Amino acid sequence: QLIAGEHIPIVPVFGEWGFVEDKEVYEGVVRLTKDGQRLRNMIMSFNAD
């Protein structure tokens, strides 16, 4: 089905975007704190125990 326009109607928004080795990588602000936050959750749970 032909649609209107010359461009694909989907617009993407990227955060920290790039190519590492012919492979796309995009990152927000959360991907990089998961380790510290999981550790903090674990230590707080140990202390509550």
Partner: protein, 152 residues
């Protein structure tokens, strides 16, 4: 080893005590030897707490085959000295005796040396707790969604 049977172990224990040996002019009547073999079986069974004690390779005699004496003990070359020194210490009270200080020291040394290797094997570290994160630097686990250690 020349000491290959439970009775050989008992004979070595008695010789260490000085009660009876191949050179003596008086010997223990075989009921005494049977009692000593029963003492040895009881001691070894108490050591080997149904698989959770001291591992030696000792083969417990079966009641069907009648004489326990004459059965090979199955011990390695390095456990015979410890076992028969402890046996001398254990069956000294039958003959109104007290094992001498050297025999007691050798018995302690032999028992500790017997448990040394099994202790080294049993000294193991438990796995990571179930609430321990795997880490984002492991790549494979992060991509497989295995973010936490299983545990137990």
């Amino acid at each position: 080893m020349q000491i290959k049977t439970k009775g050989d172990l008992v004979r070595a224990a008695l010789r260490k005590l000085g009660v009876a040996s191949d050179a003596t002019l008086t010997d223990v009547e075989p009921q005494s030897m049977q009692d000593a073999v029963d003492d040895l079986e009881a001691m070894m069974a108490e050591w080997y707490q149904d698989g959770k004690g001291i591992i030696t390779g000792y083969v417990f005699s079966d009641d069907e085959n009648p004489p326990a004496e004459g059965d090979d003990h199955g011990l390695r070359s390095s456990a015979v000295s410890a076992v028969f020194h402890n046996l001398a210490c254990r069956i000294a009270p039958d003959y109104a005796l007290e094992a001498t200080a050297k025999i007691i020291a050798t018995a302690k040394y032999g028992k500790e040396l017997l448990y040394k290797q099994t202790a080294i094997s049993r000294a193991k570290r438990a796995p990571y707790p179930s609430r321990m994160p795997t880490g984002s630097g492991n790549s494979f686990a992060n991509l497989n969604e295995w973010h936490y250690f299983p545990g137990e």
